[PDB]
Recover the amino acids of this structure.
């Protein structure tokens, strides 16, 4: 098998006015498209080096694998974390865990926003689930480094703070992007990942 | 493919008094043995992950692959860079290149000493050849990060500054270890690696 660019589950303009059609179309059809292709290229190179036992080449491929592989993991999740049917607050057991672990829904939003704005350079903000501790956890990740691969936390909600995700519309004012994106969060999807975490 | 621990080109005591037999035995039969075994286990997990397209697992395995993979690369080179017949100064084209790029042999030693002593924590000092620039270059690497895999430079001479390489004999006094190791440098091996770069 090879990786494929997943279609967006909605129209490019479905998230307006919070994220405009130009960003969505570029962020999916150009950026993510490149990560999948580069990911498949790196995996093939990594396969040849492994068959040859060329460990030097394997390690030299690690930055491309983490960046483009992480890109595929993160963005594929990101599209499902957003929806025109999104916004508002989650329900049921996820809403209860958020209040228990962060005090309230608004406190959680403040913490994830602060983590996302606090990224200096490129990276991501994540809400995750800690299997060992059995509760939610917020983390920030540099560049395309994916949450679970580098921290073991299971991703529930990611916020792409790469400049290409918002600069066209919001320019340098990243907090304006963070303010707007809460209105299109697909809490239905995020709830599925949370419920999938417990057994 | 199954990597294997290469036999040492000499007995564990052949580098005394500069590196004592206990260090050599532990550094080869324990530390390096673990890198090969851990490298093989990590490589086997990669084959499964690649076959499954599990990119998260590939990225999670990267720290173990670089540390143990790099360990295998570096230590395998390190042993050949040392010899009971070593020490003194190189000759021929290697010596002529060292004088040109670093001013003199003694000046070269000061620069490689300073790079090796300057490593805070675990890492390596390397003399390398820059193929693109066509000259020698000194660099430091953190942990077991290998020179070529992370910098593209071809390794000519490596100095292990992990504490397990000198602490038993020299304790915290790494500069005494660095001074002593010059007595067992296998310049014949370093010359072969250098001449191989100008094919
Ligand atoms: Mn992005
Ligand atoms: Mn070592």
């Amino acid at each position: 098998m090879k990786h494929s660019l997943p279609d967006l589950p909605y129209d490019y303009g479905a998230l307006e006015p919070h994220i405009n059609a130009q960003i969505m179309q570029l962020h999916h059809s150009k950026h993510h498209a490149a990560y999948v292709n580069n990911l498949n290229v790196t995996e093939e190179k990594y396969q040849e080096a492994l068959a040859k036992g060329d460990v030097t080449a394997q390690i030299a491929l690690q930055p491309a694998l983490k960046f483009n592989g992480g890109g595929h993991i993160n963005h594929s999740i990101f599209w499902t974390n957003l929806s025109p049917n999104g916004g508002g607050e989650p329900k049921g057991e996820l809403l209860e865990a958020i209040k228990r672990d962060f005090g309230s829904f608004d406190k959680f939003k403040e913490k994830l926003t602060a983590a996302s704005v606090g990224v200096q350079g490129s990276g991501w903000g994540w809400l995750g689930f800690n299997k060992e501790r059995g509760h939610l956890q917020i983390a920030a990740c540099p560049n395309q480094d994916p949450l679970q691969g580098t921290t073991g936390l299971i991703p529930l909600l990611g916020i792409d703070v790469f400049e290409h995700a918002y600069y066209l519309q919001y320019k340098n004012v990243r907090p304006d992007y963070l303010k707007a994106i809460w209105n299109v969060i697909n809490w239905e999807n995020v709830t599925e990942r949370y419920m999938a975490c417990k057994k």
Remarks:
- Chain B has two domains: 21-81, 92-197.
- The beta strands of chain B are 123-130, 135-142, 154-160.
- Chain B touches chain A at residues 1, 3, 39, 43, 46-47, 50, 53, 55-60, 62, 65-66, 69-70, 72-73, 145-146, 148-150, 152 (CB under 8 Å).
- The radius of gyration of chain B is 17 Å.
